[PDB]
Each structure stands twice: as structure tokens, then as C-alpha cells.
């Protein structure tokens, strides 16, 4: 898919 | 349609090129990707999905958007706003992980309030207001909230039973007084009940317990007097918050299981002290034993069923570490729900050699009877802080587990109708006939309290007999119950025994405890022989053992005005047993102090002895002579080493060394136990075990008894105290009762 | 006038001679027949003259005074206050404060100042809560600030004014899921708000970072969104209780200085988490160097003053438990420096002890950089539980003390003008001219981040130099400040260094810390000579040392699918240095892990090494190879023993033993240091020390530097890395740069 | 000194 959809990432910080 | 918003607790901050940070009070998150920076600023809950397209239409396709919101929904950053809730409220539940609309449904369940005791209807309404202001209907249910001025109000019993019968969950709160009590949430068939809590409370409210005894001779009392309207409103509001948390958790764990976990008050008590400012969590254990909700016949059955032992490989001979043992029994340390009031390191941490701890548990019909308790605090012994802490905790659990609760295994009978299965209490006590004759006169002149001479046992009277397991004969014998457990109530005219702590021991397993118990008996027996026959014993060469600790500790005493030595007390059982002795060189008083111990491993046995010296001795050294509150005051101040030449070592004999103490231990604690019972057998002694373990406690506790073996208290009946020394050639002929040491063993 | 016994006591009378005084926090027993007669007239409903009348023909009034006097003497007695209710009276008496005094104290007024987004209604509610307990607000002896965040910039101004005005004031955050309460600032006595703030900025690196990122695209963020009206009210009311307590304590203290003891929020911050439910007390330290209230100019002076060492007789001067105790207060995520200190390993393991310590340094200007901070945390290493705890705590404090604050000893100059005393950073870094030429290409492709190569030093540029102390030549030298502290901000076109942790160490005394630092240097130097030359070293017979931990530990690994051996890295200094190595015998990967350690006592040296193998490798074996986010991930998964023969011991050489390592230590730590400096001198090396200690911390922290000695990172400059192996006969001829180990040391 | 007054003692449990 679009790189814009591939780059999506959600992470928590500890 | 519904507004779309990112979780309300999160504060949105866009860092334009690629990142957007979701900052929260307890958690922070970071998102990556252009689309987020473009799309999220519209997820503040002011746009509908139909509305969102137009603003960015021509910039982002709709299909794209859906995928973005799709991934946001899956991963739980995305929610729909709830009209019923304010933004601040919505933020509270979403921060727990609960989408606002689920909470709105959750809060919808009503609640009932019930005042009990001296709680005002005004105060009830005050809570009603507090609860209502966060969206909780209150019925004239899913939860009953009880307000008390004291957790031991008799009215609570009736409620608890009502709860149990109707399977009704409920909550207890005490907002008045200088200490807020919040919780627990009782869930019938799941958590503990009030009675389970009450059983622990009654034990921890000792003065009150006696004062209620003294008074009714000639249910609870109001300690809750200190109350500001602020500390009152603080408790009610705090209660409301927690009530809401219970409702909402209960709702979501069913509606959406495993997605969100935060702690509620279930099976927990929270105490907030308004005066000194300290919050403490207390754990309520469900008692399989209690009459109100469990099965009180549990201990009854266990006692009358055969003891079953089993192999316990070792890994300092125990089956677990102290750090571990403490861990799984920390929760027992609590003056509210617990059996141990506190666990404090009494000694300086900058000392690497001496580690002593302090423990609680309060157990009286009188003030003078009251004074002795509150002074009886269990204490920790160790070579390490870890062990001292583990011992201090486990000794406390030990004493508690031995206290006669009323559910113990028993049957009423006479010595006659039991026959050879029964054991006469004189076999265990070993009081001489003269002592029994001059009872009152002797007990009147009481240098020491523990030397109390009980009434004669009247064989004609029917008493309560508790089954004990004999490891020698592998079957059930019987002792009078009065000997098995602490504070068994006897009639005033048949006070033939006070249960003692001799041979009582805790452990991570039964076999581990039985071993320590058995060894406690050998310890006292050897001391008894030595002390009362006033024998001269050989010193031990501490250096000959591959354990530096001994000679290091020696140097520590030496640098603190004290000499330290160890005598060999090993008697006819051959088990290594010692006594540590220390005196102050300089000053008004010698401050003689003693420590004993016995173990198959002579290294450990000595270690036990020398540590018993530390706990008793070094701390009282600080004090000037006058102020000593100890029971051993008259001993510590007056008595001399020169008056007690049996204390210092015999220079006639050679020093004992590590090679003088053969090895009889194995890699198995069970084998060590069975080795012990055999040693007793060789000496014509029977080894008996009563299991004092309490299901709600877990930690194993037992009382070992070996009828005939001597206690180190002033007991001069015929037997081992006289014969064993002659049998060992330590004496050429037995001493007479009159010749026995008139000075009692003060520790 | 009217007389009563302390109103927080329920008074119970046991008829013959006993009266029990029952409090919530305490209990008392009164002995005497007269007490029973009099005390029911001490309820606060009777006057002396009415007292004496009631008993006329019962007690002598002359006697009564003797009771009253003695009750007053012992302090069970007070004059009742008509102003207050019994409950309110009871509260203050339970704190040990007379009712008439309390009433007088509460007459005092206060100011409330909101800041940030606190509602006027919120201020009204607090005002009301204060009113309801009898406190009034002036629209003073105390100023109460309401905030939504403790770093709201307006607080800086309120603070300076308070300092110049000598205004005592209180801070409270009642909004948000976490109630912050306190401290009460007392200018000239208390910690500063700015000195609190200094701690806080560091603890919120994520939040602090976001603003930096925000300004680049171009002082606090409002996260206090989660708020129930019950939590809000819980915080205002709670605060009101504490406000009163301060007022009352303050009032009395003026009249009778030091007479009251119950705690106040003076210098404390209380955090009550509403969501997870936990209350913690956070101690605020007054920073001697606080620009706002202290003297920031201190650290400058001390840097340019000589270093005075004075003798101090596991050599660590005091117990780990003692070191922990006194420096525990730094373990707070608010006022503290260490975020937490948690046991990572199972307590049931008496061999492996590893503590995680939360850590707070990060200047990351990007998310990627933010990932790396938070990731990297200091850690605890020990043979025992107690030792590991101190290590983790002291290591966390070690790093913080190193972070460049901006008040470090400095002066701006160039190498030429400083000259002889100046020291050139390439003497320390020891990079090759090839490395410096291929920075961008080499740095761009690396498996390890610490192998970064700085831009070359530009001697023409003025820089800030920090005065270091030379122990060899006993005078001041100078290094670029960029090497002496962490995160020194350098221009983008002159990033000639990143301050590393090599040589850094903490200690209970300077000499202790310097000693550990020197050994850290020797450790690294040893590893560098071994690793990058790929020398074949001898193993160490761990049984030849009178310490079983090694042998037991080895067995542990076997049971856990591993081998553990130790190599000798002792180089030309002759200081015992070792490498612990271990490989897994099964699994998907071999998981090679390393640990290093140096000490004058070779037993300690080996112990350091092997414990650093536990610290690193053991926790990870629990993880499948696909979850590893360690920096040494690639190493752990793909690398193999066969490919690195310099890891396993050379069977060509004999095993080292305890007798191969001469004793060069004494009974003095100062003497040990002076030995190390002279061992370094005979090798042609100068020994330098910078005191990184912080007055607001206490625990000594230093960075030792010995120019020429190698780091175990990939730094192939000319010097010892090439020469030392030849001088010892480990090689016949020096290796070339092209022959050095292409694989970086991964840990 | 008197008896009724002598027996008077006070103590903290
Ligand atoms: N590591 C441990 N694990 C389990 N139980 C333990 C442990 N250490 C001590 N205990 C128990 O705690 C008690 C230890 O008391 P101890 O330190 O040996 O003093 P003691 O001399 O036996 N009692 P006393 O002679 O009356 O002062 C016994 O009940 C043991 O069973
Ligand atoms: N009892 C103690 N008193 C003072 N400081 C201590 C104590 N124990 C450990 N430390 C400190 O904690 C560290 C102990 O050694 P260690 O934990 O191995 O550090 P390290 O090897 O420098 N860490 P690393 O750089 O990852 O190898 C040093 O920084 C010491 O200064
Ligand atoms: Mg015992
Ligand atoms: Mg004992
Ligand atoms: Mg270090
Ligand atoms: Mg190291
Ligand atoms: Zn129950
Ligand atoms: Zn300051």
C-alpha cells in the first residue's frame, strides 16, 4: 500500500 | 451521528513532519506517519466521520481515513464521545482503559447505603451527595455500602450472614476517627467475609478485648472520636471514588475481559492515617476454617487423620531461601488484617555481623496480666539480615498458630478410658512432688513468672484430649489439649497446665518444622542438665570450624567491652548442642547473657547459640543500669560470672573442635527427621507431633513433644535431669532436688 | 475554668481501682480507687467547685488536687475549649495539642492563589473546606498555591517573591488522576521551588523533549485532564486538613520552639494516585547551589581548590544496607534522581542477584533518540541481595552526578594559552587518523552506537576546560569539559567528543570512589588489549580461590544450559583483571555473554566479572530470539564460539590460581589509591580525578582518567593497544590497525 | 503520705 499507510506506527513509552 | 475523539485523557501535540505525541498523566504514547499529523488534530471530539472528510477532502481519500481510524480503533487510542459524561470524567475512565460510553452504562447501576453504629444520617447523605455527583444512583442491589464507626460493631455480623445467604456483594467504610478504613468489598463465595476479618481484628485489639472481658465480668468501644469535618469529607469522597471503580471494573471485565486491569478494594482494606499521614494496604484472606462461611471441622479432621511426611531435598539446611519465605508471607504483616503487627530491624544496618528484628502479635484479665503481653514481642535471629528478617516474621506466625482458637482436634474423656494411648501430663511437665505440695508458697515467691507450678492433674476428672501423631510408633497418642495450644481455658480449680512454646517451630514444610522443633527440645534438655546440675563444660574452639563469622563476632564483642565463648552441652543423644556466654568487662554490672542452640550440623548449632546471644544482649547494653525493663533485670544487674563458675569454661578439659562432632545429617530433611526420632528411640523416648498449621496462614507450624525430655525451667521431678549426667559420668552420683541450682534460668 | 480529661480518650472505669483510657492511636491504664471516683467528672461537664461539692462526704478535696495535679503533671489533662466541638477538640489533643491553643491557632488567616487553569469555583470549594474547620481566607502566615502542574512558569515568580518576602507558602495540585500535596516552602529553611523544579524537569524527559522538538519547528503541558469531582474534592479537603495542621504547628512553635513533633508537609511532597491507589512521601532536598536561593558559584570554587584525601580504614567502607538506607531518599520519580530500584531476579535464587534502577538522562531531540533514553537504565550487581541493591542505587546516582548541569568548574581558553597543564583530547580518546578521516562512512554503518567517532579536535577553537586533579604530580591539569561530564552541548561543527562512563564511579568516600574508578579503567584497558588483538588467554581455576560462589554458580549455569569460565586479563600494571564468559549449549542461538572486572584482590576481581555476566545475559535466555531489543541483539543471535577462539581458554597455557596473584592491598583505601597511582606512574601514566559529587546528593562521585589507557570500544589510535601486548611477550610484533578485531565488543 | 493517694499510678499501654 501507500508508504503513508506502511509507515504508520503506534508505540508506548514504558 | 457520534463525535469521534482520541482518548480524552491524552493531550495531543503534533510534531509536524512525521510524529504526533499523545501525552497522558500516567502513560505517554507516540504515533508515526504523515496521516496522523494531518488527521489527528480533528480527533479532538468536534467532528463526525461524515464531517471529517470535507475538511481534508482533496487532501486525503476517505478509504485512507477509514484505515487510519481502523488501526486506531484496533489498538485502542480511538473512542466515541459519551454525551452523558463531562470531559474530565470521561478522561478518568479512559485513562483506566475504559471507553466513556461503557462507563456511562456501568455507572447506571444503583447502590444502597446502610449506617451501622453511631454513624449519622447526615453523614450518610453526605456520601449520597458525593456518589451522586459522579453519576451513581442510590436506592432507598449490585452493591451495599456499610458505614461504621468501628469494624467490630455486632450489627455487622447480622449483615454479613444476610449477604452470604443472598449472595450479596457489599462494602465496608469507616470515615470517622483519625484513621480512615476503606474496604473491603466482600464478595460471597469468593473473598473473605466479615467474620474472617473479625477473627484477625479481635486478636489485634488486645487491650479492648480485655477491657470488654473485665467489664462484662462485673461488643466494641468507640475509639472514633477525633474527626475534622475535612477528614470526614475526605473519607466519604475517597470512598465514593473507590465505589465507582468497583462498579466500573465489575462491568467492563465482563463486557470486555482481559483488556483492562486496575486494582479495586475487593479482599483489601485501605487505612489512611490523618494524623501521621500514611496509607497502607491490608490483605483479607478467606478462611476455609471459619464457622460463618467455611468449614470449622477442618482442623478436627486433620488431627485425627494420620500424619503423612515426604522427602524434602535441601539447597542453611532448609528447603527455601529467607528472601523467598518472607516474600510469600509478607501479607501477614498488618495490624488490621494480619497476624504480625510489624517487622522492624532493631539493630544498626552499618553492622554486618549483628542482625536482630522485632515482631508483634499481642498474645489478659487484668492490668498486670495485660502488662506481660505487649512485652512478649517475638524477635528475629540471624547471621544475615535476610535470615533475621525471616526468623522474626516466622516466629510471630509460630506463636499465633499455636493459640487455642476453639476448632482444634479434641475429645472429652478421662485418662482411664483412653488407656495406653494417653499420656499423663506429669510425664511432660516433670514437677517434683515437693513442688506440687508447696505450690502456692513457691509461686508466691516468684523471681520468674515462667517457673509457675500448676495444680496437680486430677486423673478422675474428664478433660479434653487432642490426638498427636507419634513418629516412633507410627500411630495416634493423646495429650491433654491444655499442653498442645496456648491459652487453653481451664477451670479455676483444675489449672494443671499452661501450654508452653518448647518444641514449637514453623517452617516452609512440615518436615522442616518438625526438625527445628525436635532440635529446640534437645537444646533445652541439654541446658537443663547443665544449668541445674551446675556442671563444668568444655569450651569450643570456634577457629577450628570453617566459619569465620564466629571469631569475627568474638572480636566485635571484644571491641565492645565483652568476651564471648561457647560451652558444649551435647548430652546422651549425641546431637551437637551449645551455649554462648558473654559478659561485660568494664562497668557496674557484668551483664551476663546467654544463647543456646542444637543441630545435627555443629556449625549451625553453634551459630544458633551465638546469635541467641546477640538479640538478647547487645541492644540492652546501651542502657544505664537503673532503667532496665527486661524480665532479666535482677539477673543482668546483680549476678556475677564468679558466682556462676559453671558459666565459664572448664580449663581442666581440652577445647572441643569441629572433629569432635560427627556428621549425621543427609541431603533430605525427611531423613533427618526419621534419624532424630530414632535417636530418641535409642534413649527410650517417644517423639510426638501436633500439627498447629492454620489453612489461612499457610506457613507450617507444629509443636514437637518428647515426654521425659527436660525443659530448662525450674522443674525438678524425677528423670533425665538427675540420671543422664550420672549415665554420662559427668557425675559419680545423682544430685538431690535440694542441691539443684536454686537460681532460675532467666532467659 | 472547666476541666476534662483529653477528649480523644474514651474513658472506661473498672470498679475497684482501674480506669482505662482508650484512644484510636493509643491506650492507657489508670491505677487507683480515687481515679474511678473522680474521672467520670472529667468529661468536660464539671468545674472544680462543682467537683468538690458532688463528693462532699466522699473524698477529701485536699486529696483531689493531688489527683488533678498528677494527671496534669502526666499530661492527661487539659482545659476544655468552648469554641470547638468534641470531635474537633479530640483531633488536636490526639496530636498532643490543647483545645484552647488549637482554637487560638485556627483564628489565623490564609491566602489562596490559583495558577494555570484552576477554576475560581475550585478556589471557592477549598475556601469553603477551610471554613468548615474554622480557617478563614484573606482577600499572612501562609500562602496556598493551586496549580494544575508543578512546572507552571508562573510559579517561578511566586517563588522569588516569596523568598524576598520571606513568605511561607504551600503548593497543591488537586486536579488530575494524581493528587500532589506539598511542600510547604519556608524561605531560608526549606528546599526551593526551583530546586524542586530542577529535579522534576529531569524526571519528565519525554515531556521535556517534546518542547525542545516544538521550539525547533518554531514551559509545561497540561496533562491534568482526568478528574472526578470526588478526586478533586478528596484533594482540596485533604489539603485543608494539612493546611490546618501546619497553621496549628506554626502557631505553637512561635511560643514554645521545638515543642511539637507531628509531621507537616514542610519539605515533603505527598502523591496520592487515585487510579492505582498508592500514597508516597517525597522528600525535597534544599540544594546548596540553587541559583534562586542557594549559591550556584560553589562547584566552581571546589574545582579550583586542591583535592584533599584523608585515610579511611568488598572493601567498601560501610555495609550496603547502611549505604542504601541513608541515600534511599533519592529514589523518587518526583523529588528524586533515581526513579526506582526493583529486584529483577527471583528471590528464591540465592546466587543470582540483579536489580533494575530507573534512570533519567536524555536530551533527545527526536523520537528515535527518545527511544534510546528510557531504554538504557543503570543496573545492580552483587554476590548478595544487599550488595546488588546498593550497586543499582549508587550506579543511578553515579550517572546523574555526571550530567552537565551548567555550574561545573570551567574556564574558556585554547590549548596554546593553557599549554603544559592542558591535555589534548586525542590523548584520551585514542582514535586513529584513518578513523577520523572516514568518520561519516564508518559511523554510518555500525552495529554498535558507542563506537561513534567524533569530529577531529580543532586546537584553534577556544573551548571550556575543567580543572582536574593530578594525583601523580599533585597539581591541577585540564581536560576539555566535554569529556568530564555527560551531554556537554557542543557546536554542530565541533562535536569532538561525547563524555563516556569509563572511569566513573560512586562511593561513600572520595577515596573509595577514586579507587573503583581506577579499577574500572584497568578493567577496560585489559579487555581492550585482549579483544582487539584477539589474544589467547589462560583460564582461572575458580576452585583455587577460597570462595565457593564461583563453583556453585558454574553448576547453576549447567542446570540452566550453559558453561561459565573465566580468563585472565591482567596486563602490564599487574592488577588482577578477568573476563567472565558464557555460552548456551542448546537453543536457537549460542547467546555469548561477557563480564569484566579488576581489583587488587583477585577474588573480588573475578567476582566482579562473573556477576556482570549474570547482570547481562541471564534474564535474556527467557526470551525467544525474535523479541530481543538489546543493543547486542545481532551478537547474541548469530555469533559463535568457533568464530571467536579468543573467547575460550588456551589449553596451551596452565590454569591461573590464587597464588599467581600477589597481594598489594592494605587495610586502608587511601593507601590502595596511592598504590594504584604509583603503579600507573611506573608505566609512565598520569592519574587524574574530577570530583563530580553534588552537595544536594551527598554520595561522592568522581571520574578518574588515565590518559593513554585504552577503552574497550573500537578506538585504534597508536599506543598501548599495539605496544603493551609486545612488551609482555604476548606477541612477537605489534599488529597493524588493519589486523585489529573487526567485530566490536558488543557490551 | 497516705494510702488512697499512694496506690495512684499511670502508664501507657
Ligand atoms: N528461613 C526460615 N524459613 C522458615 N521458617 C523459619 C526460617 N527461619 C526461622 N524460621 C522459623 O522461625 C522460628 C525461628 O526462631 P529462631 O530464630 O530459631 O529462635 P528460637 O530460639 O527457635 N525461638 P526462642 O528459643 O523461643 O527464642 C522457628 O519457628 C522456625 O521454624
Ligand atoms: N556500597 C557501595 N557504596 C558506594 N557505591 C557503590 C557501592 N556498591 C556499588 N557502588 C557503585 O555502583 C557501581 C558498582 O560497580 P558496578 O555496579 O559493577 O559499576 P560499573 O561496573 O561501573 N557499571 P558498568 O559500567 O556497566 O560496568 C559503581 O559505580 C560504584 O561506585
Ligand atoms: Mg523457638
Ligand atoms: Mg532457641
Ligand atoms: Mg561504571
Ligand atoms: Mg564493569
Ligand atoms: Zn468467614
Ligand atoms: Zn533553591
From TrEMBL, chain C:
Keyword terms: Calcium, Metal-binding, Nucleotide-binding, Zinc
Binding site for Mg(2+) 1: 395
Residues annotated to bind ADP: 316, 381, 387, 391, 398, 506, 508, 512, 516, 608
Segment forming the signal sequence: none
Binding positions for Ca(2+) 1 per the UniProt entry: 395, 398, 520
Residues that hold Mg(2+) 2 according to the record: 398, 520
Binding-site positions, Zn(2+): 192, 195, 290, 293
UniProt: AMP binding residues: 316, 381, 387, 391, 398, 506, 508, 512, 608
Superkingdom of the source species: Bacteria
Residues bound to Ca(2+) 2: 520, 523, 612
Protein name per its UniProtKB record: Uncharacterized protein
Source organism: Lyngbya sp. (strain PCC 8106)
